[PDB]
Design a binder for this molecule. Sequence first.
Ligand SMILES: Nc1ncnc2c1ncn2[C@@H]1O[C@H](COP(=O)(O)OP(=O)(O)CP(=O)(O)O)[C@@H](O)[C@H]1O
Ligand SMILES: Nc1ncnc2c1ncn2[C@@H]1O[C@H](COP(=O)(O)OP(=O)(O)CP(=O)(O)O)[C@@H](O)[C@H]1O
Ligand SMILES: [Mg+2]
Ligand SMILES: [Mg+2]
Lengths: 469, 468
Amino acid sequence: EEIRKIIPEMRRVQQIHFIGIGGAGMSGIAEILLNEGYQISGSDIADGVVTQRLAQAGAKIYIGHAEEHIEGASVVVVSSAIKDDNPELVTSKQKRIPVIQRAQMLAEIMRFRHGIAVAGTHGKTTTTAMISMIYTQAKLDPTFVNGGLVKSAGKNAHLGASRYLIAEADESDASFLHLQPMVSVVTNMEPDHMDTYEGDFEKMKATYVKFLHNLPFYGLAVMCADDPVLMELVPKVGRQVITYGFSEQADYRIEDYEQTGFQGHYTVICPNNERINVLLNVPGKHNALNATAALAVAKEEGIANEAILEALADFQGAGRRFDQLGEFIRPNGKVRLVDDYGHHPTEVGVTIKAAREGWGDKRIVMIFQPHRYSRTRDLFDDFVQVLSQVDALIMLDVYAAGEAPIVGADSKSLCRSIRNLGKVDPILVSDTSQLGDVLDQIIQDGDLILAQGAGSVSKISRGLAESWK
Amino acid sequence: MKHSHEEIRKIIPEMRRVQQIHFIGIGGAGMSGIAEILLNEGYQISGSDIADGVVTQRLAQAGAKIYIGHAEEHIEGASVVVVSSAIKDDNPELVTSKQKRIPVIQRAQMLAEIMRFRHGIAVAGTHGKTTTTAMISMIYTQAKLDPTFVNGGLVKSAGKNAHLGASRYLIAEADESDASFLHLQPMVSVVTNMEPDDFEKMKATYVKFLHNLPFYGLAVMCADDPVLMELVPKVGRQVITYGFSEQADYRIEDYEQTGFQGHYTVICPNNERINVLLNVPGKHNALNATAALAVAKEEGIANEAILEALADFQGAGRRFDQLGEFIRPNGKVRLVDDYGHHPTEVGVTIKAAREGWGDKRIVMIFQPHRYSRTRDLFDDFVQVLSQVDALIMLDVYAAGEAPIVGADSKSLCRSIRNLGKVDPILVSDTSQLGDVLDQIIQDGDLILAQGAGSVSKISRGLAESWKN
Ligand SMILES: Nc1ncnc2c1ncn2[C@@H]1O[C@H](COP(=O)(O)OP(=O)(O)CP(=O)(O)O)[C@@H](O)[C@H]1O
Ligand SMILES: Nc1ncnc2c1ncn2[C@@H]1O[C@H](COP(=O)(O)OP(=O)(O)CP(=O)(O)O)[C@@H](O)[C@H]1O
Ligand SMILES: [Mg+2]
Ligand SMILES: [Mg+2]
């Protein structure tokens, strides 16, 4: 093989089986290994768009779990969600077949590659997408594995013939400590409650320091200068650190930012005082940060300005990140529908701000679906404050993602709390078939409607668009 | 750019912005080899040593900038500094390196970086590492795979302890000392044996080492070592075993030594029978050679390349190393240098010598290495040294350490004398070694110069003198 001329095959691995292949992060890795020539099989509790598109591709997909699904596997990859009583997990274990976590299989894909890893609380998929598009435009034909669809490629993952790997690195459960990258980005590290001691936050800080310590002596850490937690960690990294951001002390410093429409314009001053005027095809200061992490990696690796500026000027985004669905003429006015993945209050907040800066004096209307009861409970007051910043609000019920309900942490509670704040009067919509009709009555001409959240909400907005189309 | 550098760069990437690599203590063994691979890969190399020498002149001629005495100015432009573990904080080069914030890494970590993007085969265990590493490197070379290798001893056929090859393969000795082997990330790991000298901690370190293998990696372990076999369920990776044991994956049967060559059959896991001629003596070498055969077979190498390399195998330097035959006034003798320094190592060497020497005598010149080791394994030394026909004792080779009452050569000689099997001669002034030997020699004696210290240098000077 042409890829084998670069990447060696794993000893005796003929078939890789994925238990929970529709789970987060699973499909992307499966795609790379399928394209490298391995036989791939996988199972999932539900049918869906991920699971069905891997089948087109050549993998055998099974709905439901049964021990016979593991027939012939050389190794089994399990998602975070899998429980000890999984008939396939149990059987694998008996046949004495190696069982690995998803981050471990990613590390093996990174092993003989030049890995560029992207981690942090917020912006990982976006930054990963931007780096991947720069490397692509520079003609470096990178492999990438992202936690969202890269729109220009039509996939969340792609196998390239070079040695480059661009990959999103998930800190959850220290997953990422098996990764051995050449360059590591950390976009930010945001505590749930900044003025209160939280043991899980300090532990998480310690895990990011260990992650950076996986860089070789000659490796590079790229960190946001505008995040005080990251800047405090600097002296403990012990590898070269390059910073980026609006801070006067940033190595790659952003100046003169403005947003026009949904595009950003700004200048980056490099460490040697080179000036780069950037046009970025997605909105908000938070995207200029993400794109500057990407420009900093590219410049540090010697990539030319032309390919960097072309990729950012034409950047189409990751799927669901401020993803414009179209304009729709309704009886009560012409409206613009946009999907956004933001699920944490900070992410929802940055999204609203970027919407506002491109939308003059027309209204912002949001359809919000909280993701998980646990996070809704943990940051409840912050969700109340941020959701009160829109002009009109429809709440959908919590997307459980597998969790058991928690009293006082559901949409009905969020709704009541927002109403009491009195900045906006929300409408709860528990029957989504009724969603279009409900919007129809509250809508006004020129409204920009944000379909917001990380769960099924984008499938819901999808239907709505089609029916209005 | 030279063709060789271009071809290597298509497989192995250059390390980011690393232009010059400086070695503090570059004449040390363990240092010069890694330094010469990096030189041959295209990096600028500089280094320092308190003493000038062959090595240092060797390096210096190849293109390395070498200096004697440690000195802050020696660090000029270094991108990274490599240090042995022996170094001290007062070291001028070390203190300024840290002050100029130039990364400072240990030898094993530089070895790990050479392994990072290669297909590493790592050789660990208490005894037989340098030998097994040399045998695997000779097989891979004979198979036209052009390996890179880093060994703790001279590979005689290649004339070097280390060599850069143009392929992806790396064969490397892995040292358990202070967990240094934990930095390595190999594809295949050999463990020859594990013998004490605390122990449960050493066991756990080896298990941790083997966990560094990828999920698909291979552990190759000696089936004849009960401690290794006890650890098998803790490994968590595929294990292939080798040895005389009935249950070995690669089983040795029908072994007989003829002269200084071994003859035996290896039976492979699918029952394939392979008849081996091994150009070095002793069952212990048949074990090391079968670790080597198993690795090669598991990697798909043809029988002919394995057999050819083993039939012409020349040994590692100082491992049952034949220095030739000499006619002395009272007899024609054969002189052999051996590095064995632990009682078990001395014991297998004596055995291999007996198996090749018929009814003639074995005379040994033994130099104990370290006072601490002598103290710790004293009784075992006394038993094993008692198995020769004539024994000359040199004084302990200190290697750093202060004398310990009761653990010196005089004490050893006394206890051996008291056992009544051999009556040893202590030779404190080595300028008289030749004359003492000439007075005890008989026609046909094999003389084994035995130990890990200066004994090898001493034996070769005796040889040169006897040559002229
Ligand atoms: N640097 C940044 N700082 C804060 N919020 C950001 C951000 N970049 C993006 N966001 C917001 O977060 C949402 C998700 O962006 P993105 O997918 O790139 O981040 P991420 O991958 O870290 C999400 P997750 O942690 O769920 O994987 C965006 O739609 C936007 O709401
Ligand atoms: N499998 C084995 N088992 C026991 N003794 C062995 C052995 N292989 C070699 N020896 C003996 O040990 C001596 C040194 O062999 P070698 O250099 O290969 O091992 P090693 O590299 O593990 C020594 P060190 O631990 O000092 O590095 C030989 O000269 C012989 O005395
Ligand atoms: Mg993501
Ligand atoms: Mg050795």
